[PDB]
């Protein structure tokens, strides 16, 4: 209902800990119309490099917003009227394996949904929309965060199945053994269903950075919401000098061929 | 979230016992994409004269959508999609006064609001919105459907005030005095509002061509849906021939000087 | 969904102060279905003299439930799943005029809605019903209340126009100014809409027993709620004795040129 | 709140590609009161051989409601208000084996519930009931299904277990490996829960025709949604015949030792 | 659920055009635990003279949140868990009469709710409260209000009827005229109702210091949000003397004897 | 809203066929505020030894709620008000293994939620919490249930994993094998989750004693209500011995360091 004037073509959401991303020079927060209500939080835009970037802090300020509450509609909705086609998302995330380390970095292929009555789609009738999502990421955006951390010597792993669970409760045991052992997950976190949908829908091309913040249930001391918060602070620099370097690697649109929700929408359209 | 393709200029929302307009010669019904679900119905669209036009039934199909029920933000979303800028409604009315006929027509210019449970607004935030209604109608739509009526000698009373209730249920004797006696409304109806408040968030011109199909509490027989129905059909060719003409008529953009909510939207944001 | 076995043609509604209706000789209380989930309480079922009787506390339990959370569609549905014919409502409400003092009782002719965001109607589609209501309650009921009074010489006014208020606050002064200036109001509650709108769409034949509570903000101390029910405490062997005698004096069915509700859903039917 | 003159024994459930059922010599489309608002479109309603059936398309004209907005309430509702005993679901499936092949019908005979956010009982409160589900289909119907399909020598699968999701994407190969080499489900879909609950508590007896549509994520291109409906338009004239021959085949009444739901409530009933 | 630290004995709820109010010397902003959810923003929180005061913005940050979407429950909730007893509102509003001019102040002893469908009270249930609203405002605060604006020679009305409307859009000429002549209101704006129940619910001293901001429809040029705006950017020093001084004049808790709402619960608990 | 008078450290929830814990030698109801509104019932309290107890029976007179309808956080916050320290939860379970013998109890150590759509937390922002669930149960207090069991020789499983499934109909062969083969679960239920969440967020230290009433799937005859109710009518003099033994033998306080969710909200926020 709003002619939005601003432009960007590169959207970051940023998770736990990274309410400043640290990339912008120089920049301004504004107001985004969007038919859903209220984006967590004002977009921060900027220039980086020859780049204009939105920037979205998917808990708000303050982290006031939880991961159940958060208004994914609003956000995606919010990035699509500024015209972004790259959605880089950081996320804080649990490992439930010994060898994705604290501080590791992995760069999640696949995922397992087992959030709860959240709002899924922008696709409610009449036009009714079943997008494909068996490679549920943005294959040429991977690829370049890949080729990011190698560049800069960035351990990170380079593929992951990340389970979204509900919360805000972190996981029981037995949960945690199923995830782990069922569902053959490598990563857990809250927030990236229906993130991931919603920007397919809106064919754009997304893809998360996740950082390892806790072993969940598996170390000596299960995880807490103190020592997510502590490890990400300890790592914020490095996730700052991968996401400077990344923004501006990207090419100015996603190949065809490289990304699956671009353009795609075509065949998902019943 | 989808392109809309199709393009017209001029929508019609027709209300009880207007289904079928009978004004096209050839047309198509299409489905079209809101962030607020489902239209009342697929939406008619077809050439007249030099006009494309998009028509919509606001009851929907069989008349299976009463007032409360109706989802007015899907149906003025469509019509903004398709690029509408004048909205034509056409609504049964009882008569508060008992100067007029059954049968006359009425082009309101003026409305008292008592619905209870709407939705109101497209402007939920972060984008705050309090759009201007000291006249609700647009002015130039108003005199170019009075001019038509004047030409085609057809009794139509050239103001008025609509007094908008909830329903489903008709008015008891005692809230009819307030409307007629202490308010001093003329018509009353059950479906303008929200649809006017949209409609000119929205920056697009509507006016209400209203006919007369009962005298409320006021007769011998109170109103009943029966007789709405039936005096709704007994007039729907002068409808029909009202509404023809007027379409011919529009010229392309209603002017920003005659149309209070065209392109106005600036001093309405906070 | 379910076989509802149990069968009265009797329902009354006790309001505040009526938990107990003091009516009953042998009784028991059963669940009764509704899509709309939970009646306010488990129904009492007896016989009064050859009737069998339904009644409802509308409050429930200890008055546990406010007007503006009652589930009028639950408890009118589950009264016609009983096959209730009669609904006698009895109820407190305020005075706005010196004439209607404390303990007299009032069967009101007229109603003004003033409740907000309540749901109205049985009927959301695809079979939309626009009852009539010009004379909202029932004529037969209403003068056979009446009558029972005269016969008991108890205090009783034989109209009246209650405004109903959305509540749970009492009026500001100047809103009952509005109400007995404005909409020439005499009497006052929270609970009447849409009770008497549903029982009308289920075809019931319904009227209400008001006694006065309370002076609104009209005597030298404004209303309480502990006025209130002090006050109908004072009052209720009053009011058992004219329930008491009314529900015997009923005919077995409703006449249909003296219920406005019965058998008149033909002529609101779209 | 409407007594229903229309009576069918007999209600089909069309799904993808199955607007019309190609069945029908003489038909109407009627409008049928639920508590629960609008039914996905009209009903048909007539007669095929000796029996009176209803048919619905659960996604309504032009495929305009999307899984996760089917009102399944005021689906099965209407066919219980008109007296349906047996409902027979016609749905596109993917198969998740590879040993089927397209073109496949699939008479399941279990399934696993992974949706999300749906209304799963027509039972709220006060009265609760806990259906059995061990055996989630109508015997006797699956039962007569297999021998249409073995006397019309369409091949058919004679058991299965169908797995749904929530959509409207379709799931990733995470989920799908969990779905397949995990839990050991064989088909899966979107529509089939709550619908065949809502049956079982409506006591009517419920069954599937599943058709394969595609292969999910593990054929060398993953399933689209323009790949289902071309693929069930492929095979809609078998499933026609399927369908007309079933219809014929039924008892006029389910048996009860042959129907786990039919007449069953009371031992699910607190 | 969490144990509050901060206190503040004195709260004020800033409207249009006074996010910042300019009263504190040193503050920090604080998140507050409701089980509503969101209040409008983090509550500032700092001392002035010998009080602690907190300050809510009720529209937010950037005047992000509409009249019909601000977490009114939210808000006082917090209020009442930092331990407020005086809750100062500044409001803009529409003139309705010609004689209250812009810049003038108005401290309003009444209101007229017409508002739809926001959530009016705390109590839901199973405590059932009824509050006494016939004076709305308290007394003491008031009358304070009224003290230091004579003090200052500020222009100050000293009475007045708010009413209370839903928007977000403004009036029409005829729902103004029928506020005036009709209701008898004197100013007019969207934010009082539901905030001044709940404060009173809450036991709390709530007055509004109301600046007029417009003349509604009665000016040659009707209100709009532009004018709004600049009129309280022309008169926010004013509001900012009259505020700091009264701050210091109030005592530490309001005296029972003229604060109506203060420790009355108990006879509006039925 | 309202200051809590009465006063509770021991908090019992009953279950299926415990709406009479028969623990009681003198009590009383009360009516408990919460900002949710309704809890189930009306909290009974009373003295047993040296200890207030509150008592709860979960699904409301007359087993009138059912699991999916629960208002888990008025439950839990109406025992917080009362100032509870200890919750237990007595609740029917199924078994998932042929050696939990009907009537046996099963003191859980571990839970798996397979529910959809219920309320989770009481902390939706913009105070946000993450609470660590990785042994879900307070360990104090499972080792007192644990002790009096011994002391009291009734045959009680010491661990178990319990499945918490969104009901209200009772699993399928092919869910039932999943629970079991796949997931590891023990025992099925309906309404441990959120229950136990709730209360770990309210810093209570709760415990859940099961008892076995059916052997869901997996007997000759599946499960049923009906039996659910007899097996647990069976048993019940046992569980108030066991229930009655447990509330003498709790300490004043939960010790911090065998009680998890006791005072370590500080590490849970965010
Ligand atoms: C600040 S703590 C809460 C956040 O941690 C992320 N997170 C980190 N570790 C885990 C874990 N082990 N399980 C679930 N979510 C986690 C979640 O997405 C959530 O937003
Ligand atoms: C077909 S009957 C119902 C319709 O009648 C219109 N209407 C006609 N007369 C009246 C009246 N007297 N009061 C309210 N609505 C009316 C309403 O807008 C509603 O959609
Ligand atoms: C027990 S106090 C609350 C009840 O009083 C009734 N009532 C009595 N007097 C009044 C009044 N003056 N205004 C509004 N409702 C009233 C209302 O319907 C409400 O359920
Ligand atoms: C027309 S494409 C969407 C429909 O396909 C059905 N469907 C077909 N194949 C699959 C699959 N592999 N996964 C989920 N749903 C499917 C679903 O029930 C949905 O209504
Ligand atoms: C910034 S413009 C919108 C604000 O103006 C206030 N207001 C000012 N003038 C008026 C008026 N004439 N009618 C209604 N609200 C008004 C309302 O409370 C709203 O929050
Ligand atoms: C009275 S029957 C319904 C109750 O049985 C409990 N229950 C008992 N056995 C089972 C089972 N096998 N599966 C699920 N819930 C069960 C549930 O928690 C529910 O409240």
Redesign the interface.
Known sequence: ??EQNEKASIGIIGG?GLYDPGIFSESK?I???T?????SD?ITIGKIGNKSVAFLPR?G??????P??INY?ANI?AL?ELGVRWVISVSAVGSLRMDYKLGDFVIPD????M??????????????????????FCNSLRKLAIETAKELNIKTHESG?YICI?????????????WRE????DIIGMTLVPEV?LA???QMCYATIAMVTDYD?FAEI????????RVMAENTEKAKKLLYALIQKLPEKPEEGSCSCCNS??????
């Open positions: 209902m709003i736990s927060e107001k985004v119309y038919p859903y209500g209220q984006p004002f808990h300020r303050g982290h006031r917003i939880p159940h509450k509609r909705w699509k696949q995922f397992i949904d959030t709860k009555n959240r709002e899924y789609s922008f696709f409610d009738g009449p036009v009714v929309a079943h997008v494909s999502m068996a490679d549920p199945t509900e919360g805000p409760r972190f996981s029981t045991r037995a949960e945690s053994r199923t069922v569902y053959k997950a949908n397919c829908e809106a249930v299960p995880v807490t919401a103190e020592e997510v918060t929408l075509k065949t998902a359209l019943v």
